Structures are given as C-alpha cells and as structure tokens.
Amino acid sequence: DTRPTIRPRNDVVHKQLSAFGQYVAEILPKYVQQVQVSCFNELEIFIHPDGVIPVLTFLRDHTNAQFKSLADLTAVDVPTRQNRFEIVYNLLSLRFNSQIRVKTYTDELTPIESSVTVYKAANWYEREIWDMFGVFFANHPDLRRILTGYGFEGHPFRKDFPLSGYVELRYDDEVKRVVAEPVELAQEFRKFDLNSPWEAFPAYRQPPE
Amino acid sequence: GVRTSPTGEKVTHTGQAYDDGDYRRVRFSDRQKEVNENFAIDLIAEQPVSEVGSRVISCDGGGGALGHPRVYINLDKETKTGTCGYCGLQFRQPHH
Amino acid sequence: TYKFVNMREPSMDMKSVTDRAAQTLLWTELVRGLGMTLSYLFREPATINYPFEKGPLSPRFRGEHALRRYPSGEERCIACKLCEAVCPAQAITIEAEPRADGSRRTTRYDIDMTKCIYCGFCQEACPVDAIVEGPNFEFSTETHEELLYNKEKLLNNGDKWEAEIAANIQADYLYR
Amino acid sequence: AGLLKKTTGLVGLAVCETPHERLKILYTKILDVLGQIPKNAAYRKYTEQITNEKLGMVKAEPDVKKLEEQLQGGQIEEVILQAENELSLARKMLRWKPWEPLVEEPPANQWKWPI
Amino acid sequence: RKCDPHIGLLHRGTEKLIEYKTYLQALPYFDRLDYVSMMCNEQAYSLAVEKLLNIQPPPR
Amino acid sequence: ASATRVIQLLRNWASGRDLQAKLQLRYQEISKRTQPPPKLPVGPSHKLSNNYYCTRDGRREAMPPSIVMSSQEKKAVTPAPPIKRWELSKDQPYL
Amino acid sequence: YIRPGGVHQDLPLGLLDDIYEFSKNFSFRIDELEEMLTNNRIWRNRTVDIGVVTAEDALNYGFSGVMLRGSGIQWDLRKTQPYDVYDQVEFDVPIGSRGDCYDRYLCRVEEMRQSLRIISQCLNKMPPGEIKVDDAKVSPPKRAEMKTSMESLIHHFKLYTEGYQVPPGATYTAIEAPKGEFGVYLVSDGSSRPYRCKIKAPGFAHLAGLDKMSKGHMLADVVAIIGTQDIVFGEVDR
Amino acid sequence: TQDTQLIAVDEKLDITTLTGVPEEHIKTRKVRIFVPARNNMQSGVNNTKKWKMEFDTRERWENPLMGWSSTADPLSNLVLTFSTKEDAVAFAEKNGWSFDVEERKVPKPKSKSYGANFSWNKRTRVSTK
Amino acid sequence: SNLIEVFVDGQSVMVEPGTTVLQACEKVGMQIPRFCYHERLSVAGNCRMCLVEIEKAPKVVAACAMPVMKGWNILTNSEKSKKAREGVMEFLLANHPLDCPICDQGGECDLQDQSMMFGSDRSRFLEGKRAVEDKNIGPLVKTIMTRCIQCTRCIRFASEIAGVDDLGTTGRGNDMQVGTYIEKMFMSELSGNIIDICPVGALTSKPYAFTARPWETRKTESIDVMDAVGSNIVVSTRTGEVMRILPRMHEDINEEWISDKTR
Amino acid sequence: GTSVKPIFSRDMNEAKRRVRELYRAWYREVPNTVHLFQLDISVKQGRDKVREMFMKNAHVTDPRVVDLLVIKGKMELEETINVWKQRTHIMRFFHETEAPRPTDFLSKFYVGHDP
C-alpha cells in the first residue's frame, strides 16, 4: 500500500467477523432480520423488537460468542420512519476482543422489554433514554428523569425539540424563588444551510425512486 | 478623522451616531464613547500611488506569508487605477 | 504483559514479624510521613508574586481578541465571514457593506466575549489574519455589557496590543 | 494439577478443588439438554459439534494446566462458570423457541441509511 | 442501605448541540466533556471520525 | 539549589532521598523561550506527478456495508480466536 | 489540538526537551506520593476492603478502566485492541487481586510509572513527518499554501464554511481513556454534520454501580467510593 | 406470530399529549411541507431530494443593544428531513400540527439538440457560443 | 416504442432517441459535473467537465453533446473519466484569481462545490496568473471579469432568452475577454437572471454586493407582485430582514427567471 | 397497521381505572406536599389544579398514549412525596410570575402581530 492517507483495510477480520455474521443468523432466525458488516470491520445485528432479552442473553452466555460487557444503548430518532426510535445496544467481547451491535426499531408507544435482566449495567442507560428520548421500557423497576431537570416536560433529543427548549429560568423577586417563563433568546440561534448542492460521494447513492 | 455629533458624542467610521431623542444614549452617559481615532477610510489614502511598469501585478500585502493571498490585479484601465481588493493599495502604470 | 500490584505475602519468620510488630506498636511508617513533609518544609516554595511576575506562556497563546490592520493602517478584515461560520459558540456576528471608497469592508463586528470559548478557530479561519487573540488575560469587568465587544473595541485593542500580536504571529506563521 | 491454586487471580469466582469431574458433569448435562432439541434447528448442529469435543479434552487429559492451554478459556475455574451459563443458555432458548422463522419483514423500508 | 445517586446537576445538551454543529465545530465539546482530563477525549472523537472518513493520520 | 549545605543534608536525611539530584522546579534546564526559525517538512502528496486525488480519495474508497444475509457439516466460527493469556511482566512480576 | 487527520499545529522546537526534563523528575515525585501514601496505616485501613466488587458483577455492570483491572480482569484497550500507535510501545497493565479501592489506588499509581515508560519511548522515538494528513479535503492546508495556491484557498474556504462531508455509517470507537473506556457512537447523515453522536462516558457506567460498591459500608466511606469510583460530573451528567 | 396482545386500534395516532409542545405551538404553528427548490445560483441538484418540516416566521425584533434579532418562538430552526410526503404528513398529525403540503416540482423534460443550433430555416440557428 | 436502451455504470435505463448523456444519467439520479450547460439554455459543451469515459471507447466523450445509442453503458465512475474531470477542473482553476473570501459566490459557488467533490487537493501551477480589465454594464450587476471561466453562459442567455446582443467574447488565445468591447449597459428587463446563470463571481448583484453570505440566509418562498405573472421567488432573509429575491423553479409560468424589477 | 401492543392496559375501562387510581393517589397527596414543602398555597386550589390538568388531556382516545400518560403522572407524584423537587419546581406548575396573555382577538391585535 503506497498510499499512506487511506485507512488501511483489514480483510481477515472482515471475513472472520462476517463468518460470525451468519452464525448468529442461522441459530436465531426467529429474531434477526438483517446482519451487516461495515467497511470499518464491525457487525450490526438487526433484530425485531420482541426478543431483546433472549438474543442478548444468547450473546451473553454463548460459549463461542460470550459477547457481554454492554457498552451503551441509545436511539437515533430517525424521523422519516414508521418506527422513529431505533434502540441500539453495544457489546464488547472480552475473550475475542470484538464488538457487536444489535439495533431494533420502536415507536413511541411500543415498550421495550427491560434489558436490565441481561445486562444490569443497563439499569442507567435506559433511564436516560426514558426521558431524553421518550420511549418507555416495559417491566422495569424504576424509570425516572436522570439527565434533564426535575419536573421537565418534553423529550429533548427528539428531533422536534429545539436547542433552547421551551422554558427559560431566572430569579424573580416577588416570589423570592427561581421561576420559569417561555423561552425568549437574547440572540437567535442562527441556523446554517450548508449542505453542498452538488452530488457527494457516489458510492452510497440512493437508487432512483 | 472623526467629527463630533451634535449630541456631544463622536461618529464611528461606519457612520454611527445616536440621535438626541433616542433613549439608548443613556448607555453612553456617565461614560465615554469608544471610537477608533484612526479611520481606515483615510488611512488608505496617504499611501503613495505605486508606479510599477508591468501588465499584471500580484499584491502579496507585505510580509509574504504574513500578508493576504496574492491577487494578480490588472493595470490596463487607464481612466481607473488598479487596486488590490484586499489591501486597497492603488497600483497604476505611470502614464501607460 | 501484566504486572501484579498486590500479591506480596509477609514472611512469617521472626525478623519480618518483628518488623511488623515494631512497625505498628511504635509507629514508623507514620513517622516516615513526618520526615517527608519536613524535608518539604525545608525546601524553596514555587509561588510566584502576582502581578510582579507571572507564569510563563507561549507565542501560540489565545486570549483577548483584537482585530488588526495592514502597515498602511488599512484594516485587514474583508468581511469574508469565515470566522462567524466556524465560531463554535456563534459569538461572531458581522454585517458587511459596500464602503464608500470601494474596499467594501465590514460594518459590524461584535464578539460576544462571554459566549466565545477561546478555541482559536477564528484566527485560523481568517485568510488575512484579521482576527487574532491577544496574549492579554487580565481584562475582567464588573458589567456584562463590557464583555460584549464590538468593532470599535476590537479595533482599539488592535491599536493597543500591536507589538505582541506582530511579534507572536512573527514567531508562529511558520508553525501553523 | 500440582499444588492447588491459592487464588484464580479474579475476585468473586474461587478455585474449586474438583475441576475435572465437575467440568464433566456440566458437559454431560448440556448434552442432555441437547437431547430434546429438534435436529433441524441450527442450535443442535453447532452444539453437538463443539460440546462433544470440549467434552473430549476433559477426559483426554487429566492435568489442569495441559487441558487449559487447549481450552483457551483462561483457567478452568471460569470455564466451569462459563459452562454453567452455557447450561443456563441452553435452557433459556428451550422456552424462547427461536427455531421458527422470524415474525415479519420490517415495516416498509424501516432499515437503510441514509434516509 | 440506599445508594441511588441524583445526577444531572451538571447536565448540558452536549449531544443535542453536537447534532447542529459541524464536525470541526463539534471537536471542542469533548475537550469540555471530562473536566479532569482534556486531551484524551479528542483522541476518541478524532479516531471515530477518521475511521468513518477512511483516512488515517500520518505517523508523525 | 540557593539552599546551603546544612539545609541540604537535613532535607536529604528527612526524606531519605537525594533531592538535589533533580528538583521539582527548574533553575536553568529549559529551552530558551524564543527559538530559532523552523522549517516544516512535506508530505506524501506534495508532488506534481502521479498524485491524482482520484486514486487517493479515502472518502470515495468507502463502499456501503456489505450484505451478508437478508430476510428478503458447516463448521463453528468464533468472531476472533480466544485472546492468549498475557505473561507476568519480565520487568518485575509482583509488587 | 487533536483533530480528524492529526494535530493541527506542529510541535514547537525544544518542547520535547522539557517533556524529557519533567518526565525525568516526575518519577521522583511519584515515589514521594507513595512514600507518604502507600504504607500509611490510616489511609490503607480507610481504603482496604472498604468498597469491593467481584469480577462478574463488575464486568457485567459495564465497568472499565481501573475497576476491571483492580478486580483482576486482564483487559485493557491499549493492549487488546491497540489503536493508533499503541501497538509499537512497551508497557504493562497494573492489575491486582482483592478488588478493593486500595488496589485501585495501586493500579493508578503503577499506571503512572507504566505511563512514564511510554513517554520515555515516545520522545526517544519521535519520527519526522507532517503533523496532519496530506488530504486537503479533511485537513485544512498550510497558511502559506492558502495565500499562494488557490485550491488551498478554496478547500480551506469550504472546510471552514461547511467542512468535510463524512460518509454515512455508524461506529462506536472507544479508547483507553485515563479514567476508563471513553467511546463515541457517531452516526453520519452523509453531510457535513453528525446525525447523532452518543458519548460512552466511563464514569456513567461507573456511577451506575455506586449502589453495588457502597453496599453495607459505613456512611463515611461513600465519599471514598466516589473517590475510587472516579466520577467527574462533566461526563456522567453528560 | 407476535402474540403480545396484538389488538386492533384504529384511532389516528395522536401523541400530542406526550411530545411536549405547549397548548399554542400545537395549533397556531402552521407548518409547510415542500422540497427545497434548487438554489438558482448552483447548477447542483443534491438538495431537492428530500422533504422538510419548515415552519412559518414569527417576530424578529432588534434588541436594545448591539443589534441581536432576539426571538421568542422556539420552533424556528427545526427543519426536518423526510424521504417522502406520506410519512411527512404522518409526522404532522401525530403531534397534532396542521400541515400545508406542496407537490415536488419535478423538472420538465429537457429535449435538446446540438445540431439544432446549426440550422437552415429554423430560428434555433444559434450565432453565439 | 422507438426508445432505445442503454446502461449507466450497470443498471439499464430507457432513453429517448437523440438523448444526450446529461439527460441520460439524470434519470437514475446523477448530475454529471458541468460548467457550461444549462437545462433550458442551448448546449455549449465548452467547459469539458461533463467528460465521461466508457469501456470499449478509447476516447472520452463530451456528455452534453453526445447522442447516445444502443449499448452505451456509461462508465460514470471510471478512473479515466475521473482523471478527465480532475485535469479539466484544475485547468479552469489555474487562471482563476484567489478572490474566494472577497467573492460573493463564496458558499454558493459552482466552482467551489465541484472542486470539493471532483477536485484535487493542491496546485501544480508555478507560473504567473492572468488578469482581465473589469467592466461596468449597469448599476445593478457587478462584473469582475478576471473571475470568468469563459463558459459563455452569459452570451447565450442574452442572445436566445433576453433577445439582446450586448454580450460577446472578444480575443484570440488564452485572453478571450468576454464583455461588450465598446462600453454599454445591460438594458434587458430580464437582465437580472444573468447573475443566476453565471457559475462564478464574475457577475454579481450590485445592491447585494457584500451584504450577506449564503450559509446564513433562511430562504423562504413567495411570488412576484410587480407583474401579474406571480413569478415564484425565493426570499433570502437574515437576522430579521430581506436580502435578495431569488427566482424559484416553476417551469410553465416562470421557469427559473424573474424580472429585473422584482430582483 | 391496526393491531397494536398495549402499554400496560388494553381496554379503556381499566385504562381509565388506572387514571382513577392516580386520580385517587394525588388527591391523597395534595395536602402533605403543601405541608412539608413549607408552601404558600391552600389545599383547595391544588385540588382543582390537579383536576384541571387531568382535563387539558381529557380528550384523547388511544389507550396506549393515555397509558404512557398515567405513568408520567406517577412519574411526577413520587418526586413530590420524596421531596426530590424543591419549592421552585411545584410552584412552576402554579404559574404565578408570568404575565397574563391577551385572549381576545382585539387584545392580541393591540399588543403585537403574533397569531
């Protein structure tokens, strides 16, 4: 490779992890809709929002996988989708020093089975998602506000939520307490329309609809 | 070169000066008005008009790399005099 | 390659247990603590006298901002608006205008000093080295309005801090 | 084998003085729970492939160290723990029942990036 | 007997404003993320972005 | 440095360590604050020939994720071979 | 200072010498820390067996950094998955038994020494080359290039108006942060902005286990637990 | 196949109670739905391919100080990005926002002929290149 | 029926007889890089950025003036076409004055956007540059003729749509000045659109000159009212005031052009 | 499509029943918060305050969305009893500082051009 600017590819890991790709597919055809390996040598296991506990428990205790040590769970809030929220788990294999990603789809009114049973690390990641995204997780001991303020109303990382939010706080003398009023900014957050009108990288071109 | 407004303040190079009836003048009272004494408008004129005998001249802006991106301004419009769009220095061919 | 941090076992011979019993009954490791700080007491302090002398800095220091001007006195800014676009906290607000002479420079240049983050993206964004951060850091105030800068104040600082800006950029234009 | 390990190096799980037959009893049970799994399921097609052999090296070698260097599961004090949850995992998918095909293709083009 | 921590007393919409700033403007947030260590956070953000960009840094 | 011999042997004895070998503050061991002018190097693409950016574009070399299985006797394969156990560091095993 | 594609500015001349000066004297200071702290009975007694988590509970809780190493787990991102240049360097990972906070205190201290050898090799083996990638579409060109060659001006102009456009993807890249495993899950829309970038704060997982590592101990020890839990409000509160 | 009390509910999805919008920004905020027309400056097209959720403008008043255009409406810089228009409206009424849709202005066919520029009795004979 | 079949880097596409490559690959969602072709303006084929090489064809073909026939699987991303786009661009780039911070097209410039996608990363030009005398053809458009790319888009728009011949390209060689020779002024009632037609900062709006930059304008849609046509317009506002009136796309009523009065 | 997954409650009868229990719980909790928070309001105005925000969302049909709504009310009641919220948080609900806004079309017209 005479070119030193490109990221050097790693073919052996690509095929080997891809070989693990259909492995997790064949033994669990009930759950996995799609298995993906990227150019960055990582697998994404697309699962239905029904068997989160089993498929995670499968990766957690399998002798040839032992995929455990949950990294983080987070959504994307893809708005132009019939299931906006996309809960995404990340697991870090210790024995095989590899990483996995299992992603579901979920509407705002379709609970997610609480993965705290599989990874009782996930006791805190989802509480953030409960308030910061709004998707509620079913059969869970406690899902409170852990990131936003007390009594806050809304779901901030929802794509419909503004940067400044809906309320602004100050100290008001007659009430002798901090009070919240409708947000009015000293400076408007100047948006920037900046995407190039010309065609980007042709590799990922969307096919003609 | 800056004149004093009728209210008592000065006028910025942009041409800013508050009218007397405006209530915002209170921000300046009990204080002073910060205005740069030097004005770039009259600080470009005392530069002597350069007389260079060439068709096209690149004006680096002094200091080479410690200047502005070079512009190959053109010296053929005899009625006008060429000027660098970054520096403003007035380049003209003597009598062409 | 891994190294254990606590796997040592205490030998049960009479010498080692005598060391342990002597260690706790008549405290020694604690007295060793006394001896260490006592040596620290009989040592020079590293405390400078402010503002009689201050800690060293570097020519790349980013501090209070200041617009500059050409040796002719002509301003460097061309209202290309690069600094506003990159300004990560949107502390740059500028408005251009076709100046009467024809050089057409900016009309407004307000740095929201209490919104800026001193990241230094503004100076590297400018293609004519117009906006730079002076090495000053003692420019505190008692009023919020003082912190909100403007074109006039920025130009004044460039007229004030000019020896440092010229010298620091002279020691750095080869680096960046 | 040799002298018993004073500590496995990890707090929590502790050294067990009977590692061979204990690893044996887990690895016959997972065969037992592999008895009542239908053959068409891919779970059986891999479990019998792997569990029969890592049953074999247990009986093949009677020393703790020599079978450890081929197990590649660290010390055996954690592979019996690892076999335990594998024995747990075998029972879990018994009532998960994943051998059937998946429920449904995703709503329209739910996947795919960019939007 | 109870050890539930009340957190968020520092919370800022870091991810939310990351969504609206460009990658170059997104960089200073990570320097501000951990207020104990600054620079090692830039390593994480930079390593991710170059991986997506399929660009590797020079050995220097 | 400043500090006389009498204070020195007190601080060496009380600490038990030779502190005068290296100090926690610098008297004269630093680089001179101003530096001679530098000359920065060049890189792999500061050439005028066969450096067409088309055959260097790491952004354009990235293909979309490769399909594996879509919903629309075989061996058993591990995501990666088990990690080999590390050795007791030959520098100093214990502590 | 660290940007996609390298470091924006160069190393000032004579900087590495001062690194050598401080690093040479740094070890001497760290022994002074150990001399006061390692054998001090009051500190030790207030930090032995006070707060303890087992291997499987810690690793299941998403712990990382010192705690997995303190509990005895043989894992470290620099060794297992060497990123950047960490493959070509020699050091050791200070893991320990027991798993209490004293060993975690010992784990950090030996990390200091095992760090110091890395800088010792780094400034001994600093290679000559450009500070940033030679790709102008991701790395702004040099200032001299900007004011001389136009494509430098255009690329810098576009790099400083919208910047590079990251192709779509979704990677969670984590590194051995000094306090733990810091990761970012960044999804790219395909434009010059990140669609969503989720930060794996090491303390966020660490503080999540505060209940487990503060069970049964007296009230006075909780501040010690967060002391060894190593929670900085900057990232746990996001 | 997915037996988790799969029971039919046909009322239109209305999450307006839980999104967080206040009682006046849910109704008064009329929202437009168009495709951004190509910027006539640029011949590039790669911005007309998606839909958005642009809102109408509110008061932009000059602040007493240096000239910030202080605003009091939070729903200003919240344009969305949508693949089609049916999901666009599907987003509209779930949070209960009145829509105002607009069909995509697909370019008309561009039948051109270089030989047409050079003709015999046709006006399309071009004398400028 | 009579329609003939071709491919575009794989996928089969159905095309009209006489179809050019530009109007052949746009059916799948491709914009071939162009600098001298406009959809409703007559073909030029002069910028040579439309160039694309196909397999089994030794020489690259001018896409905007190439009548496609059966079995023409246009290799859009072929390396030779990629080489052709790079060299042709850097040839435009060579004699371009470094005015990007002082050109209003900055942020909405076709030359800048294309040079960021189909562009190199550094210059091989080590010689002196070329400069052109600026003209003045009305206190409504600014003419920085040094930034011109000689795409001749101005002269065609005037002669075919505006119905006037106050624009032309004088000279022989590299110089090729485009202007009026004798000083004149653009009297067309549709003269304002030539600002939108110019891909570079050669032609720019005098009233708007250095008042705003493209990436801060919150575009909004409205109509003309000066004329009863109700021409669709794009109103570019910033921080609470209107900067420029830009023409929208509506084809059968106003296409992409608006009257000088409403501009 | 049409088939949906109930959050916790399928039928509206028992969905409104949980609302009733939340309705029961808060009316038992209105006075104690006022007592413990050293508040400056009476028990009455809180009760119809509680009533009226049962009413701003009383015109919704979907069983799922109200079932997320009832747990959200639960998501506020436990914060009040556990004195997690401060005085400034529950008097924010008792909107006091903000100026009353124009209601009639003419008053809106007189103040400003905001529809």
Ligand code: SF4
């Ligand atoms: S240093 Fe301050 S003014 Fe400059 S770009 Fe950064 S935030 Fe803006």
Ligand code: SF4
């Ligand atoms: S300070 Fe520099 S970057 Fe900012 S507008 Fe002026 S010239 Fe442009």
Ligand code: SF4
């Ligand atoms: S026309 Fe484009 S390339 Fe030329 S100076 Fe203007 S912005 Fe730069």
Ligand code: SF4
């Ligand atoms: S002036 Fe503009 S439209 Fe005319 S030829 Fe030059 S670039 Fe083309």
Ligand code: FES
């Ligand atoms: S468009 Fe084909 S050459 Fe200009």
Ligand SMILES: [K+]
């Ligand atoms: K133009």
Ligand SMILES: [Zn+2]
């Ligand atoms: Zn100049």
